[PDB]
C-alpha cells in the first residue's frame, strides 16, 4: 500500500542527499577570501516625502526612474514624482485594507489588491482627465499576497490559499493554477526573461516554477521558520531568502544547495525584505530593529547602517539604472537614500 | 529660474494636499472594533439584535458611532490576519458555557490572544453566553463539574457577592468557577497594560450597547490618564 | 467632449457683452481656460487665462482693464464681460482647455467660436509666406528671437494645424513629441532658435496653415503661418 511509495521516496530522497553531498567540492568563503575588501560606506538620506495618514505597505518604482506608487491602509494610493516631491495623482479605493501595489512597465495601469479576495486595475491614460476602474479579478478564497505583471495583458498572482495563478486581462478568467505548497505563501519574484518565477511560503520551502509548462521544477528546504521576502539575482541564477530567525540565506539554482549565510550574534529581529544592487557587490536589508543593514555578497561581512526611522520598515526598493534606493516604515514618512 | 509649467504643477499639488488633509480629518470621528469567535456561539445572534468578503456592521448610540468587524475563515492560524490590527480599542470575545466538552480547549485558545507579541496594548472584553441552558443543566443533575473538572469540590462559594441569588446556591457556584478560571490566566501576567471586563448575558438581552460603550469610555479614560503623567 | 459658445453682436462703440461657453461630457473643475481671437485676415492672437480654482488670471497686456472672465462650476460654465468697444476688436473668439502636469499635453481641444463685428516681448517668424504643390516630403523652418531651452532639459514649442472651414487641432508638441491620433508620417526635430516641421508621403486632406508657436513665457505669442496649395 503506501508503504511501497513511503519506502521508494525515502529511498529516492537518501539518493538525492547523497548526490548532494558528493557534488560538494570547495567553500565559496575559501575561493573568495583573496578579494579586497569595499570598505566602508557612508550615505545620508537627500529627501523627505510626506502626506500619508496611515502606516505604508507597500511601494514600487517604475521603469522610468522617477515616479513612484505608494499605498497605505487610510484608502488612498498616491503617485510621486521624485526629483521635485510633487504629487500626480491620488486615487480613493473601496476596500480600506490593502497589502500589495504594481506599477506597469509600459505606464498605464496600476494594480491593486488587499484583504478583499478580489485585484483591481486601474487605467490612467484617458480621456475626460480622471482615474477609473477598468477591471475587477475575482475568484480566490485567500488573501492576496503579491500579484506582478507579465504584459500588458498578463498578470501573476499570489494568494493565501495556498495557490498562484495566472490571469488574463481581455478574457478575465485564469489559465493555469499552481498547486504543491502546504501553508500560505507569502512571496513572489520573477524572472528578467519572464519564462520562470519562484515563490516563497510558511513551511520553509521555496519551490521553482514554469509559465511554459506549469508545474513545479525544484525545491529547496534549510530555514527553520516563515519566509518573508525573496530576491532573484541580476544575472539569473541565484536566489536571496529572509526568515524570522534573523538569517538571510542565497541558494544556487544550478547546484541545487547553499552557498553562504548572513548571521549576526547580536542581531535576533526578524527580516522583512532584501533586495540587490545593480552590480550585485551589496545585499540591502531592512530589519525590525528600526534600522536598516547592508551586506557584502562575497565576504558575508557587515559594511554599514541606515538609521533614522522611528518603527519598523515595511518596504523598500532600489532603482533601475542604481541612482538611489526608497526605503518606507510604518512612521508614515517614505525616505529616498543616495 | 522656474517655468510657468512647473508652477502650475506645484499649485496642483498644493490643492490636492489640502483636500487630503480635508478628507482624512473626518476619519478620526467614529470608533473601530474587532470581533473574534468560534462555532456554535451566538455571534450573528447579538449582531442582529444590536443592529436593530469581510462582513463590516456599523451602529450609533448617543451620537457616537462604532464599526465592528468579522472575518470568515478556516484557517485556525491567525498570522498577518491579526498582524494588521493595532489600533481598535477592544477586541470583543464570545464564548459558549454550555457545551461542558469544549472549554477546555477554549481556554487555550484565550491564552494565544492574550500572549501575542503584537497586542501588547489592546484590551479584550469577555462574554458569556446561553445562561439558560446552564441553568437547565445543573437543575437536571445529568451532567457534574466533577466527570471533567475535579477542583470543583474542594472549592467553596465567595461571599459578599450575590447578584441573584434566589435561583440555587448552585448556579452561582458554577457561575463564580468558570469566571475564576478565565480570570485566572488574564490576571497571571497582566503587568497592567491591559485587563480584562468579564459579563454575563442571554440570548434575548437587549442592553449591550450601553455595557460596550461605559466599557469604551473606562479605557479612553485610563489611557488618558497615564498619558498625563497623572497615574 | 463638447464645448458650445453663444453670444456675438454688432454694437456700436462704447458698448458692453458677455460671450457665454459651456462643456458637457467631461470633468470640468480640473482643467484651466484660455480664450484667443482671430482677425477676419490675420493670425491668431491671445486674449486672457483662467487656471483652476481661480488662483491667478491673466490678461493680454493690450486689452487690460476692460476685460473681466469668469466662471461657475456648478452650472459647468465660462463667460466673459468686455466693455469699452472700440473698432479694432471685430473678430472671432475660440475658447480652448489644458492641464499641466509631469507629462500630459496642453492645449488639447478647441471648441467651436462666435463672430464680432464692431461699427521685451519674444517674437517669432516663419519665411514661407506660401508653397505651392504628392508622395513629396515637405520641411518648413521657424526661427525664434531667444533660444528656447532651460536648465530641466524641455524645449518649448507646439505645432498647429487649420483646415479650411475648421477649427485648429494639435500636431506636436515639446518639440519632439507627436500627439494622439494622427498619422505617424508627421515628424519635428532642430536645435535653438531654428525648428523645422518634415511631413513626407504626402497624401490629400492635408492642405492648410501651419502655425508654430511658443510657451516659454508670458505673453504668448503666435506666428505668420504658411500654407500649401495644391
Known amino acids: 500500500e503506501l508503504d511501497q511509495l513511503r519506502q521508494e521516496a525515502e529511498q529516492l530522497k537518501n539518493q538525492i542527499r547523497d548526490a548532494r553531498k558528493a557534488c560538494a567540492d570547495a567553500t565559496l568563503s575559501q575561493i573568495t577570501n583573496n578579494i579586497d575588501p569595499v570598505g566602508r560606506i557612508q550615505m545620508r538620506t537627500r529627501r523627505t516625502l510626506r502626506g500619508h495618514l496611515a502606516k505604508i505597505y507597500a511601494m514600487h518604482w517604475g521603469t522610468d526612474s522617477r515616479l513612484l506608487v505608494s499605498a497605505s491602509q487610510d484608502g488612498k494610493l498616491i503617485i510621486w514624482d521624485s526629483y521635485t516631491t510633487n504629487k500626480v495623482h491620488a486615487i480613493p479605493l473601496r476596500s480600506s485594507w490593502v497589502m500589495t501595489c504594481a506599477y506597469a512597465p509600459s505606464g498605464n495601469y496600476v494594480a491593486c489588491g488587499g484583504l478583499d479576495n478580489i485585484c483591481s486595475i486601474y487605467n490612467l491614460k484617458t480621456r475626460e482627465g480622471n482615474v477609473r476602474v477598468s477591471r475587477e479579478l475575482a475568484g480566490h478564497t485567500g488573501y492576496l499576497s503579491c500579484c506582478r505583471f507579465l504584459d500588458d495583458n498578463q498578470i501573476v498572482t499570489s494568494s493565501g490559499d495556498t495557490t498562484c495563478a495566472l490571469w488574463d486581462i481581455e478574457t478575465g478568467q485564469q489559465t493555469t493554477t499552481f498547486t504543491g505548497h502546504t501553508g500560505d505563501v507569502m512571496s513572489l519574484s520573477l524572472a528578467p526573461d519572464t519564462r520562470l518565477f519562484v515563490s516563497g511560503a510558511c513551511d520553509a520551502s521555496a519551490k521553482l516554477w514554469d509559465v511554459r509548462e506549469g508545474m513545479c521544477r525544484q525545491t529547496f528546504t534549510g530555514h527553520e521558520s516563515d519566509i518573508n521576502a525573496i530576491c532573484f539575482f541580476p544575472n539569473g541564477n541565484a536566489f536571496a531568502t529572509g526568515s524570522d530567525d534573523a538569517t538571510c540565506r542565497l541558494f544556487d539554482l544550478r547546484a541545487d544547495q547553499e552557498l553562504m549565510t548572513y548571521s549576526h550574534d547580536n542581531i535576533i529581529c526578524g527580516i522583512t525584505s532584501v533586495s540587490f544592487s545593480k552590480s550585485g557587490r551589496l545585499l540591502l536589508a531592512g530589519y525590525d530593529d528600526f534600522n536598516c543593514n547592508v551586506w557584502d555578497a562575497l565576504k558575508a561581512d557587515r559594511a554599514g547602517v541606515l538609521a533614522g526611522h522611528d518603527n519598523r520598515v515595511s518596504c523598500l526598493g532600489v532603482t533601475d539604472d542604481g541612482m538611489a534606493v526608497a526605503t518606507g516604515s510604518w512612521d508614515s514618512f517614505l525616505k529616498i537614500w543616495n | 529660474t522656474v517655468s510657468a509649467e512647473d508652477k502650475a504643477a506645484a499649485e496642483r499639488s498644493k490643492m490636492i494636499d489640502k483636500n487630503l488633509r480635508e478628507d482624512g480629518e473626518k476619519a478620526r470621528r467614529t470608533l473601530r472594533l474587532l470581533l473574534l469567535g468560534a462555532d456554535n456561539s451566538g455571534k450573528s445572534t447579538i449582531v442582529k439584535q444590536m443592529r436593530i468578503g469581510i462582513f463590516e456592521t456599523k451602529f450609533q448610540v448617543d451620537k457616537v458611532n462604532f464599526h465592528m468587524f468579522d472575518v470568515g475563515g478556516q484557517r485556525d492560524e491567525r498570522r498577518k490576519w491579526i498582524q494588521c490590527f493595532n489600533d481598535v480599542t477592544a477586541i470583543i470575545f464570545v464564548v459558549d458555557s454550555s457545551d461542558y466538552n469544549r472549554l477546555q480547549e477554549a481556554l487555550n485558545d484565550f491564552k494565544s490572544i492574550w500572549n501575542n507579541r503584537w497586542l501588547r496594548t489592546i484590551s479584550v472584553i469577555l462574554f458569556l453566553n446561553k445562561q439558560d441552558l446552564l441553568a437547565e443543566k445543573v437543575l437536571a443533575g445529568k451532567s457534574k463539574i466533577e466527570d471533567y473538572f475535579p477542583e470543583f469540590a474542594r472549592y467553596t462559594t465567595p461571599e459578599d457577592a450575590t447578584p441573584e441569588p434566589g435561583e440555587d446556591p448552585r448556579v452561582t457556584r458554577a457561575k463564580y468557577f468558570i469566571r475564576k478560571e478565565f480570570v485566572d490566566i488574564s490576571t497571571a501576567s497582566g503587568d497592567g497594560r491591559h485587563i480584562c471586563y468579564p459579563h454575563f448575558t442571554c440570548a434575548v438581552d437587549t442592553e449591550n450597547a450601553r455595557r460596550i460603550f461605559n466599557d469604551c469610555k473606562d479605557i479612553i479614560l485610563q489611557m488618558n490618564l497615564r498619558e498625563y503623567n497623572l497615574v | 467632449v463638447q464645448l458650445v459658445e453663444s453670444g456675438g453682436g454688432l454694437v456700436q462703440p462704447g458698448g458692453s457683452r458677455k460671450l457665454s461657453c459651456s462643456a458637457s461630457?467631461?470633468?470640468?473643475?480640473?482643467?484651466?481656460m484660455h480664450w484667443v481671437r482671430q482677425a477676419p485676415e490675420k493670425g491668431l492672437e491671445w486674449v486672457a487665462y483662467?487656471?483652476?480654482?481661480?488662483?491667478?488670471?491673466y490678461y493680454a497686456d493690450t486689452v487690460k482693464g476692460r476685460f473681466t472672465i469668469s466662471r461657475d462650476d456648478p452650472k459647468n460654465t465660462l463667460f466673459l464681460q468686455m466693455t469699452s468697444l472700440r473698432s479694432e476688436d471685430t473678430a472671432m473668439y475660440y475658447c480652448?482647455?489644458?492641464?499641466?502636469?509631469?507629462?500630459?499635453?496642453?492645449?488639447?481641444?478647441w471648441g467651436q467660436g462666435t463672430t464680432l463685428t464692431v461699427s521685451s516681448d519674444i517674437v517669432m517668424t516663419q519665411a514661407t509666406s506660401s508653397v505651392p504643390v504628392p508622395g513629396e516630403s515637405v520641411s518648413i523652418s521657424c526661427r525664434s528671437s531667444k533660444s528656447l531651452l532651460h536648465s530641466n532639459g524641455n524645449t518649448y514649442l507646439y505645432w498647429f494645424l487649420q483646415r479650411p472651414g475648421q477649427s485648429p487641432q494639435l500636431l506636436i508638441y515639446?518639440?519632439?513629441n507627436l500627439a494622439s491620433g494622427v498619422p505617424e508620417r508627421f515628424s519635428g526635430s532642430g536645435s535653438g532658435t531654428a525648428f523645422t516641421l518634415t511631413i513626407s508621403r504626402l497624401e490629400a486632406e492635408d492642405v492648410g496653415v501651419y502655425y508654430c508657436?511658443?510657451?516659454?513665457?508670458?505673453?504668448?505669442?503666435f506666428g505668420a503661418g504658411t500654407k500649401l496649395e495644391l
Open positions: 515639446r518639440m519632439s
Open positions: 480652448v482647455r489644458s492641464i499641466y502636469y509631469y507629462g500630459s499635453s496642453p492645449f488639447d481641444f
Open positions: 508657436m511658443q510657451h516659454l513665457e508670458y505673453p504668448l505669442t
Open positions: 461630457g467631461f470633468a470640468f473643475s480640473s482643467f484651466g
Open positions: 483662467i487656471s483652476s480654482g481661480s488662483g491667478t488670471i
